[PDB]
Symmetry: C3
Subunit: 252 residues, 3 copies
């Protein structure tokens, strides 16, 4: 030996570069919401950002199908799951002739965050279908006058599971069923995800103000619905090198 | 007496807490746009935020029905009120075969703001259907070169009416008809609503920059259309404890 | 002479006012995305702002028709260009029974920026249909782990063409074909456009923080599709006094 140490070192340097690039303030951080439906459908929403990733989904987008992702016949709503149905979710006994539970009302959600993220700072907020701040312990939803928009429970970091890519943790995932227990049965959501900083300089303000504000909405939001998780993982998540926990609790 | 002063005081403390919580920077502020249609339909858009609530509605969302709120048959546009119709609004005599005035073109709007808000700072901007800055006094719409994006008239605070919840003012409401007089006949809107601060520390910047920027889009926007105001008030506004002025000028 | 110098001077002062008003931090800056389709259709998206204009378009809005701009029959998708089609764009050979290239997949884009803009600071980012950061030189799309969200090539200022209104430059335009050469064949985009400042005070932060953040989303986004460029120019661009480069390279 050692006749190919230069090629080796070069590959080593390349690997180091890709793996550590995540900590760059100009790399991507990713927030993915995977909605799960009792017919096997999964609807993906994926946000990208550099310093801060924020967003939300109201019922119109929590449900399937919708104006963003029509079903295979170009329909954005289903019979029995249209306006009257939504009205019955907004207010108990406030609807009319519709299905009790929509086929297109998700039963669960996976929330995935990937990147060099300030994990502890992550906020995931649950609201009812009417935009009311939701509370655990059979407390129901809070009005606008009593509703705490930033609660201790929004910090979900400790409930999230570490997801590895090779030998390092790449991201964290949270799985929750919509059962009125640990989450609303017909929720809407808001979220905030923050860049982990390798220094003390505030890149959300000062000389960085103009780009910090712009970056909030200057990255397209990917979204689609897939016939099932298997297809979503092979055709989206894997090629993106987004980590994802499958139905069996495996990181894929 | 006084054998239940502890229960009394406790209820008193609870009431004080809910009523004053509104001034907390972590409470909710609410901005509601209620669009009114000549068929009795009201379309509600409700934004929530902590420090700053901003948003806008273009014609696609000013009209009914739309991709956000389809009619009872899953339709997002009506015959005679589709693309050619919109084209006739954008430019005088620029359309073709459509109704002169859409059933789904709103005739009026109520703008409601609720919370501990910096009332004087509120901005409501009117634009034409083509995004032109609209002007009063038969001046018409301004081009991009002459258009003032922040005008004295955007400060509508003095035209808004105080809306009480019990013995305190909870919010303010502005009612305007779309008649080319005090508002465009086919308007689009933009708005900015600001947290009233109980101190001098700028919570929109400095150490608060990261959360101030995130909070702009991290709360879901509620939206629906109701068959009439009566149903909207009993099934949405009242349970939310959002104040609202009805068709008779009454606070409900 | 000179019996009408007062009228002359007055017109002169008026002209000076309109022409220089663009440099006011309270004037408008405009960002227009014109998508071009092989059937002659052009779809316009026009953003307005004061200090910073940012936005993006995912495939749902890059394509025609969509939920924002339905075709003449109220349809938001076409046969053979619906969900399965989108799936074939997201992943090579990941779709099924659909047209190879949608009639509604744009073949080119004009990107126009107008106002007193910090021209050099302009960012236009290209992504693939799956939200992957796109690269030139047959390099393909980058994963989330390797993707550089702020690249040297996003600064397109030097590739843009000056567009005059009278004797001054009013804006700049960039024309690009979606051919996998200088742009993705099925792109999605994100952009950031910045106010040119006539002073050193940072109006994106400090005492200007609250309004800087709000202004990001407080101006409605105009959007429509026109049967062809000729109609779009006479009925939208010209009356708005937005400069625009036509199919012949002429400023109109
Ligand atoms: Ca308990
Ligand atoms: Ca007058
Ligand atoms: Ca080369």
């Amino acid at each position: 030996h050692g006749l190919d140490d230069a090629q080796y070192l070069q590959q080593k340097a390349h690997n180091k570069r890709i793996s550590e690039f995540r900590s760059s303030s100009n790399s991507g951080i990713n927030v993915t919401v995977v909605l799960k439906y009792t017919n096997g459908v999964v609807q993906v929403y994926n946000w990208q950002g550099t310093e801060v990733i924020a967003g939300s989904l109201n019922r119109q987008l929590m449900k399937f199908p919708n104006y963003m992702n029509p079903d295979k016949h170009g329909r954005i709503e289903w019979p029995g799951e249209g306006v009257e149905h939504q009205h019955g979710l907004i207010r108990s006994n406030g609807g009319n002739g519709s299905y009790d539970i929509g086929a297109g009302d998700p039963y669960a959600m996976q929330f995935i965050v990937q990147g060099s993220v300030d994990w502890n700072a992550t906020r995931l907020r649950f609201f009812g279908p009417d935009g009311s701040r939701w509370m655990p312990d059979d407390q129901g939803g809070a009005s606008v006058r009593a509703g705490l928009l930033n609660a201790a429970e929004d910090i979900i970091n400790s409930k999230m599971q570490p997801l590895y890519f090779c030998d390092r943790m790449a991201g964290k995932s949270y799985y929750v069923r919509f059962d009125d227990k640990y989450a609303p049965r017909f929720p809407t959501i808001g979220f905030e995800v923050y860049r982990y900083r390798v220094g003390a300089t505030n890149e959300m303000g000062g000389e960085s103000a103009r780009t910090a504000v712009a970056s909030l909405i200057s990255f397209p939001t990917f979204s689609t619905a897939y016939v099932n998780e298997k297809v979503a993982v092979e055709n989206f998540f894997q090629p993106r090198e987004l980590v994802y926990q499958n139905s069996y609790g495996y990181t894929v």
